[PDB]
Design a protein around this nucleic acid. Structure first.
Ligand SMILES: [Mg+2]
Ligand SMILES: [Zn+2]
Ligand SMILES: [Zn+2]
Ligand SMILES: [Zn+2]
Lengths: 87, 513, 69, 115, 140, 140, 86, 265, 49, 196, 49
RNA sequence: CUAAGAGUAC
């Protein structure tokens, strides 16, 4: 795994979050919220887990990282904090 | 075969949003979604459990953490159930639930888009008119299927990846796959004509019908001696602010003598009759611009607003069609008959030349093939000329002409066949063959190559077909039906093979495929 | 089967004009249009109700009753 | 199977009222009144009588769906004029006109000898 | 008495037939509404059609004005009239069929063909005369 | 509020086209030889014949007082005073094009809700027109 | 023999409509036809992309295959984005 | 002062009149109310004791529910939904009974004159089936072969045509305005000349024809409607119009009442 | 109005569909395709009744 | 369906007061869309409507035999003799407001068949129910409370959407999910697992 | 019932991809209905007198 | 269970 892990200083993937990454991040976070995970943002009365996760993503309080797998087996770790959600 | 699925007949609903689907109440009571009990939703889940499974909205099951499943039928005997955090309430699907919606001959992705539930009190699935084009679905008895996601991850990705607004522009040909169709498409053309003026009482109702109307009455195009609004001016309310579109048709200038073309500045229609080229599923049109400038949600809202206002105006204006729309006046019918007779005379002259062997064969084919090619070309151009005469005769108040002009339904060939001349009947790309010995029917003599002998139908549908023309037309129609039945199976097989071949191709993170 | 009680379209009672219609066709030798006009059926919605009726009940009555008392 | 009962077209349901008024935030001095178990019959009449009023700036109605018997009527009047008062005046005018019509028809019918 | 004859497809190869007696047997201002017909410019006929409309079958003989229609539409109606609901027999009350569908008030067509009174369609109709408007009324 | 433009024109042609309520007219100014007008007019609501002398005015507002529409249109109360009282036919529209016809001639395009107007003349008297909303007032 | 009309850049700059004579042939003998003097060997084309592949190469065969698929797709006037057929 | 009425024809079952000095909305609302808002009596529940006929039980029930019944005093009856009885009582229903036997060797026609009112009417004028033809036999309900019997009991409640069309008293209502098309509310379809191809209405005799040279009158509104109300027979034709006006007035008054009662809370 | 023409087998009404076939004792000549070594075939489906 | 291949389902039902009406108070039993007419070219539908209108007015029976000498012109002349517009158009009024419709409506009697396909024989939904004995998958058919086939090309469409987890949930959690114990040395399911 | 009692079937495969047996032949004039065929895989193969 | 047939929407 030491050989597989591309060091953070020379990642060569896009800094933008893909549509599939955003969809899975929202799904995963909404599923965790539905199972009584602690919330990292203040709620303004919303009760839907999906929109709670959307609010968490809007201000980047989701503590997950994407492990993007290159076709050779190597991977790059991009935190949700540093991924630019342009879409 | 999977669970949590429904199937039933579909009906259209102009009063539904683009991404909504109307779900029958009994179907909504049968299908359920399991919702995890959370401090944020304990009260409403408790209320649904109290309501029970026999009335909507309500819950059908309670899945305890121990795995035991409390059936809400026969559970009222035990009394009220106290819910604990971490339990599951398997409850009826309510409004605004993401559901996958499919029509079975599913040939591309846009035939499996995701809708929002709207519970309705009847036995048919209800969907917007515009979304029927990607589904290739009519309302002549079509059935469609419904799949309910059963977890938060599937629900989230179904709403964020497969939603109807996200599929407006398709990758298949980089242009929108949904547009304005049929009645709305015809009413939008009738409404935006320069003649169309609206009085105050109807303007207020049309403005109120637009859900996102900002609440200001636009100044009328005409102020004295009577306040009148134009159709373009009221339709412009639906169009979002900040949209520019400029298309130049054939012969249009900056002034539009024919009112063709299209100029929209800042969401206001400066000029141009709105028709298929603007609000259809065409590249560079209004739908494409709005969805590439404001986002898919605003475009779906545009679909809804346009449909609502145009349907209201057309409801209170009216549109019909009848037998009188297929009738051309006397001189036009005289000219059509003259054209047909002249073309028949030309065919007779060519036949006379061919029978005298004075005809010279085209380089690359036999004499008979050249003769048949000439005859077919003459007859086809005859039918086209007669149809053009008939189309020119038709007035602007003609209903079939109006539908063709809007692009909603019909074509020039339909007008030609209904009014002027049905034309030349062909089987296997050739004229009607000699099924009998040297003749098509036992009512003709041997070796008859005349247009009427080998399947030219010089009568229109209005005038009616003679028995021989009727039989030849039946032969042509049978050929068409057989071709359709073969083509559907062949395309299905080819599509399966192609999909199996390419299923594993994917774009990776280094941009390679 | 048997004459409908009311016109489908407008709701005019036409169920009592059947035997009179048959009598006019038979006894008075009137044609269908004059007979319909004589009974007061002026809208073509009612005229199609009476004119196109097929009285199948007679065929049913030709069979012997299942339960005869 | 799924067909709703016909009496739901006119009988008020349990827990709902004939009228409900909501202030409109789009424009000043504007309200939206929801009429329950009503249809075009009342809506068109009320709309026309309101438009006859001189201090009513805006009056419109819509039946959002044919399935359900209810409609929404938006009213905006000039400043210092309660939209509820405009609705009251419209209803009063409608009632007076209908009463005069009934009286006139009765008087005209009583003059018939071939009836 | 030798007034009519039976001909099969083999013998039909060697005969000349007249479509209608009036327009083709006797040696030949016209209504412009009438369809265009030809005299065939030949007099050596051996037989005559009893009626052209007898080329149609049982299901197609119900269609009104089939010659003003596109042919696939006629095929569709011929296939779809067998699914029409009506009275299949008058003794349905004494039969235990697996499934039976009956109209309350079958009505004979206002527009009827001559060949449908040999099919007993007026006696056992399978539809009703509805007042139809062709209009874009409400968008539904 | 003030008249941005005012002139007297003589109508040389009225073209109904394919419409029944709208006609396109061409008019030549009777004072300036370089100013000409093309205009769509609702003839049902304001009949116009050829060889008719029309006073045409373009204004930025209708109120008699000078400028101190964003406010929603309101039906005219009794006693309201506006410039339209002096004219017979008032339209409201937006300018959508300014064109340099020549060294001195310029053209301005207006659209009143789909009714098109093109006004052409030298810049010495059409300079008041600018890219905004305007009222067109016509009297006979 | 047919008369076609192509777009040739004029010496003054524009693309003008220039007509040419083009030979259509039933049957394929690409290897022998290509070497016939008087023709343009570069521009010769064939419907049979197998012959194109076995005479010109795998890349030219791929180009001919794409062109044939595109002709099929656009025969009825439909338009498909390039990348799918590619 | 207000809406004016002048009636051309008065008959037993038709009334033809002119409704002038009134808005289009008011006339259309009155027409709609006459169509589907006037209460009427009609058979609602059927108990079939014996049926050996050739018709199905619900077939005969559907036919019976469509039989018009007298509804002159229907305002005195109460709806079954707002009555304190269990299922049906004398204060909210009328009980009829049909009992026919095929004792004749020929076919016996069961008409609606054979319906017998069983429950006491307490002096009201409701319940009796409407008889119109000269023979005296009402609607032909059924037919009986020899040896066939039909015994049944009907309960009739009051209802409006919105709940079911069997409670409608109004038949077809003719409604027209502006016969000369002076308001230009229609654009006439035509081939050569729209005046020749469109037949003139019978009401054109009651208005002045257009002068064919005058300009279009853009200030003219729609009034002076021509209407014709037909009666099925449940209530007299004049009562149809009068009760329609009354019902519309009641609806508007109920709107006022709800507004005032929620204003005081 | 029943026309008959059907059987009743185990209480079920069964109808025999007409079956189309090539006529017998007729000499038919057919051309054959290029790959086959025979060019034309003349055949008779002889049958005795 | 009419007798000319014009099949269709009921979109909605309106009461009499809401349907459009002619000046004689006649309301239609059916309303069909104009757009069904031009592309399908069923002119016989319109001709038969006109003939049926004339026949209902005059009391005769309409001869709609195929190859007779009956023209639209003669039918229109007969209709005009009855006091109606010869081409079958009528001035209709909007049912909601009473105002005249700007367009005149083609209107008349036409023969319709009720087909055997009704919605109540086709509506079907299933959350959970009987399973097949062999494959432990839902049974087939609405008569057995079965489940809908999630075919191959449906799976391909869902792949194209990119929704992996929804496809997995469809194929496992909704149809048949079975837990099995496997060895580590060998990959076979020959593991005796006494869970108790 | 009538159309069923007058039905003829041609036993060619029904899955075969040849279209000539299904086409309406000229000799069918007056013997089988020109437009009364099933519309699926039995189009033209199933005929009516 | 198997086999067969009639279909509905493409
Ligand atoms: Mg369909
Ligand atoms: Zn009627
Ligand atoms: Zn009671
Ligand atoms: Zn092992």
């Amino acid at each position: 795994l030491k050989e597989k892990a591309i060091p953070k200083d020379q990642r060569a993937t896009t800094p933008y979050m893909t549509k599939y990454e955003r969809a899975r991040i929202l799904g995963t976070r909404a599923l965790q919220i539905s199972m009584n995970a602690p919330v990292f943002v203040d709620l303004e009365g919303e009760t839907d887990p999906l929109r709670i996760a959307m609010k968490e993503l809007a201000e980047k309080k989701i503590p997950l990282v994407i492990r993007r797998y290159l076709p050779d087996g190597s991977f790059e770790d991009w935190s949700v904090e540093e991924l630019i959600v342009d879409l | 075969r999977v669970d949590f699925s429904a199937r039933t007949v579909i009906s259209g609903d102009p009063n539904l949003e683009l991404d909504q689907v109307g779900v029958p109440k009994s179907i909504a009571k049968t299908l359920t979604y399991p919702e995890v009990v959370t401090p944020y939703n304990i009260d409403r889940l408790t209320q649904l459990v109290r309501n029970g499974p026999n009335e909507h909205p309500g819950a059908k099951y309670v899945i305890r953490d121990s795995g035991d499943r409390i059936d809400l039928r026969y559970s009222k005997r035990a009394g009220d159930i106290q819910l604990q955090y971490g339990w599951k309430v398997e409850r009826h699907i309510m409004d605004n639930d993401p559901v996958l919606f499919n029509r079975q001959p599913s040939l591309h992705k846009m035939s499996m888009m995701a809708h929002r539930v709207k519970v309705i009190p009847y036995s048919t699935f209800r969907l917007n008119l515009s979304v029927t084009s990607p589904y290739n679905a009519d309302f002549d008895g079509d059935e469609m299927n419904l799949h309910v996601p059963q977890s938060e991850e599937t629900r989230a990705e179904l709403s964020q990846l497969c939603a109807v607004p996200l599929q407006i522009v398709s990758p298949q040909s980089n242009k929108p796959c949904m547009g304005i169709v049929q009645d709305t498409l015809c009413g939008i053309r009738k409404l935006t004509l320069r003649d169309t003026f609206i009085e105050l009482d109807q303007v207020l109702n049309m403005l109120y019908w637009v859900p996102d109307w900002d609440g200001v009455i636009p100044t009328p195009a005409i102020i004295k001696p009577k306040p009148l609004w134009s159709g373009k001016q009221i339709l412009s309310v639906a169009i979002p602010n900040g949209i520019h579109l400029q298309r130049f048709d054939e012969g249009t200038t900056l002034l539009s003598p024919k009112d063709n073309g299209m100029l929209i500045i800042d969401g206001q229609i400066i000029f141009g009759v709105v028709e298929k080229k603007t609000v259809g599923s065409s590249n560079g049109g209004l739908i494409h611009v709005v969805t590439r400038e404001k986002g898919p949600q605003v475009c779906a809202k545009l679909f809804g607003n346009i449909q609502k206002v145009v349907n209201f105006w057309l409801l209170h204006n009216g549109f019909s069609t009848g037998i009188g729309d297929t009738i051309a006046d006397g001189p036009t019918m005289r000219e059509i008959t003259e054209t047909i007779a002249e073309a028949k005379k030309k065919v007779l002259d060519v036949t006379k030349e061919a029978q005298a062997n004075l005809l010279t064969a085209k380089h690359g084919m036999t004499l008979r093939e050249s003769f048949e090619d000439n005859v077919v070309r003459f007859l086809n151009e005859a039918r086209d000329k007669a149809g053009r005469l008939a189309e020119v005769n038709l007035k602007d108040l003609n209903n079939v002409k109006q539908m063709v002009m809007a692009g909603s339904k019909g074509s020039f060939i339909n007008i030609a066949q209904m009014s002027a001349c049905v034309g030349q009947q062909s089987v296997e790309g050739k004229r009607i063959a000699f099924g009998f010995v040297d003749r098509t029917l036992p009512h003709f003599s041997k070796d008859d190559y005349s247009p009427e002998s080998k399947g030219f139908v010089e009568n229109s549908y209005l005038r009616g077909l003679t028995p021989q023309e009727f039989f030849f037309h039946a032969m042509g129609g049978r050929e068409g039906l057989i071709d359709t039945a073969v083509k559907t199976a062949e395309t299905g097989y080819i599509q399966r093979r192609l999909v199996k071949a390419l299923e594993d191709i994917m774009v990776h993170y280094d941009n390679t495929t | 089967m048997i004459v409908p009680v009311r016109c489908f379209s407008c709701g005019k009672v036409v169920g009592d004009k059947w035997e009179s219609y048959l009598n006019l066709l038979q006894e008075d030798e009137l044609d269908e249009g004059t007979a319909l006009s004589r009974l007061g059926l002026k809208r073509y919605c009612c005229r199609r109700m009476i004119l196109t009726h097929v009285d199948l009940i007679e065929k049913f009555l030709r069979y012997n009753p299942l339960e005869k008392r | 199977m799924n067909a709703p009962d016909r009496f739901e077209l006119f009988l008020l349901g349990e827990g709902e009222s004939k009228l409900k008024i909501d202030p409109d935030t789009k424009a000043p001095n504007a309200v939206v009144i929801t009429f329950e178990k009503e249809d075009h019959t009342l809506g068109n009449l009320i709309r026309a009588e309101l438009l006859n009023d001189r201090k009513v700036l805006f009056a419109a109605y819509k039946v959002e769906h044919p399935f359900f018997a209810r409609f929404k009527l938006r009213i905006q009047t000039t400043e210092g004029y309660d939209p509820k008062d405009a609705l009251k005046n419209a209803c009063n005018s409608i009632i007076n006109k209908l009463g005069a019509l009934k009286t006139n028809f009765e008087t005209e019918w009583n003059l018939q000898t071939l009836a | 008495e030798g007034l009519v004859e039976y001909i099969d497809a083999e013998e039909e190869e060697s005969i000349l037939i007249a479509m209608q007696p009036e327009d083709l047997e006797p040696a030949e201002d016209v209504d412009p509404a009438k369809r265009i017909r030809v005299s065939h410019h030949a007099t050596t006929f051996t037989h005559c059609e009893i009626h052209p409309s007898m080329i149609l079958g049982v299901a197609a003989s119900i269609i009104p004005f089939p010659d003003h229609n596109q042919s696939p539409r006629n095929t569709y109606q011929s296939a779809m009239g067998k699914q029409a609901m009506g009275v299949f027999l008058t003794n349905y009350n004494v039969r235990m069929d697996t499934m039976a569908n009956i109209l309350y008030y079958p009505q004979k067509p206002l527009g009827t063909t001559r060949a449908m009174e040999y099919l007993k369609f007026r006696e056992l109709p399978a539809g009703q005369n509805a007042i139809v408007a062709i209009a874009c009324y409400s968008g539904y | 509020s003030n008249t941005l433009f005012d002139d007297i024109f003589q109508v040389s042609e009225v073209d109904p086209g394919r419409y029944n309520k709208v006609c396109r007219i061409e008019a030549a100014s009777t004072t300036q030889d370089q100013c000409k007008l093309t205009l769509d007019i609702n003839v049902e609501l304001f009949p116009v014949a050829a060889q008719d002398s029309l006073t045409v005015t373009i204004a930025s507002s209708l109120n008699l007082e000078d400028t101190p529409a964003t406010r929603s249109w309101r039906p005219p109360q009794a006693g309201d005073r506006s410039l339209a009282d002096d004219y017979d036919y008032v339209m409201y529209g937006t300018a959508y094009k300014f064109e340099e016809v020549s060294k001195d001639l310029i053209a301005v395009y207006y659209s009143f809700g789909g009714l098109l107007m093109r006004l052409e003349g030298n810049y010495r008297n059409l300079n008041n027109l600018k890219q905004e909303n305007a009222y067109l007032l016509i009297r006979r | 023999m047919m008369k076609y009309d192509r777009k040739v850049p004029s010496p003054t700059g524009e693309y003008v409509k220039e007509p040419e004579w083009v030979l259509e042939t039933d049957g394929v003998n690409l290897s022998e036809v290509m070497t016939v003097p008087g023709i343009d060997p570069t521009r010769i084309y064939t419907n049979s992309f197998i012959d194109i592949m076995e005479v010109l190469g795998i890349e030219a065969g791929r180009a001919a295959l794409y062109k044939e698929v595109y002709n099929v797709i656009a025969s009825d006037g439909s338009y498909v984005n390039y990348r799918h057929m590619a | 002062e207000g809406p004016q009425v002048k009636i051309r024809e008065a008959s037993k079952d038709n009334v033809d009149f002119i409704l002038s000095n009134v808005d289009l909305a008011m006339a259309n609302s009155l027409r709609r109310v006459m169509i589907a808002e006037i209460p009427t009596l009609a058979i609602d529940s059927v108990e079939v004791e014996t049926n050996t006929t050739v018709l199905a039980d619900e077939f005969i029930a559907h036919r019976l529910g469509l039989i018009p019944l007298q509804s002159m005093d229907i305002e005195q009856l109460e709806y079954s939904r707002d009555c304190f009885c269990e299922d049906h009582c004398d204060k909210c229903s009328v009980v009829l009974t049909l009992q026919a036997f095929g004792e004749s060797e020929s076919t016996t026609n069961v008409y609606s004159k054979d319906l017998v009112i069983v429950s006491n009417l307490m002096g009201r004028n409701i319940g009796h089936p409407i008889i119109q033809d000269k023979e005296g036999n009402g609607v032909l309900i059924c037919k009986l072969r020899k040896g066939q019997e039909l015994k049944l009991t009907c309960v009739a409640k009051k209802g409006i045509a919105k709940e079911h069309a069997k409670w409608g008293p109004a038949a077809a209502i003719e409604f027209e305005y502006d016969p000369w098309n002076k308001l230009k509310h229609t654009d006439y379809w035509y081939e050569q000349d729209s005046a020749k191809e469109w037949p003139q209405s019978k009401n054109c005799e009651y208005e002045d024809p257009p002068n064919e040279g005058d300009p279009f009158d853009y200030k003219a509104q729609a009034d002076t409607f021509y209407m014709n109300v037909e009666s099925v027979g449940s209530i007299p034709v004049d009562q149809v119009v009068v009760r329609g006006i009354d019902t519309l007035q009641k609806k508007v008054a109920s709107i006022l009442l709800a507004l005032t009662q929620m204003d005081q809370d | 109005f029943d026309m008959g023409g059907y059987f009743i087998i185990n209480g079920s009404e069964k109808v025999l569909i007409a079956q189309e076939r090539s006529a017998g004792n007729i000499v038919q000549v057919f051309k054959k395709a290029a790959p086959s070594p025979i060019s034309h075939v003349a055949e008779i489906r002889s049958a005795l009744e | 369906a009419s007798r000319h291949g014009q099949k269709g389902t009921i979109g909605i039902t309106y009461r009499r007061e809401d349907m459009p009406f002619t000046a004689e108070g006649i309301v239609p039993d059916l309303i069909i869309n104009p757009h069904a007419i031009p592309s399908r070219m069923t002119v016989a539908h319109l001709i038969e409507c006109l003939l049926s209108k004339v026949a209902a007015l005059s009391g005769n029976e309409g001869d709609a035999s195929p190859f007779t000498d009956i023209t639209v012109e003669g039918i229109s002349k007969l209709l005009r003799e009855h006091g109606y517009q010869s081409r079958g158009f009528e001035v209709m009024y909007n049912g909601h407001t009473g105002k005249k419709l700007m367009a005149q409506i083609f209107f008349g009697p036409t023969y319709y068949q009720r087909l055997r396909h009704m919605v109540d024989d086709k509506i079907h939904a299933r959350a959970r129910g009987p399973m097949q004995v062999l494959t432990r998958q839902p049974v087939e058919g609405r008569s057995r409370d079965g489940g809908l086939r999630f075919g191959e090309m449906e799976r391909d469409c869902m792949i194209a959407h990119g929704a992996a987890s929804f496809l997995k949930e469809r194929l496992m959690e909704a149809s048949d999910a079975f837990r099995v114990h496997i060895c580590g040395i060998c990959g076979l399911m020959t593991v005796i697992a006494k869970l108790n | 019932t009538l159309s069923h009692l007058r039905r003829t079937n041609t036993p060619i495969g029904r899955d075969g991809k040849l279209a000539k047996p299904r086409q309406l032949h000229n000799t069918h004039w007056g013997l089988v209905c020109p437009a009364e065929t099933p519309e699926g895989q039995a189009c033209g193969l199933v005929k009516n007198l």
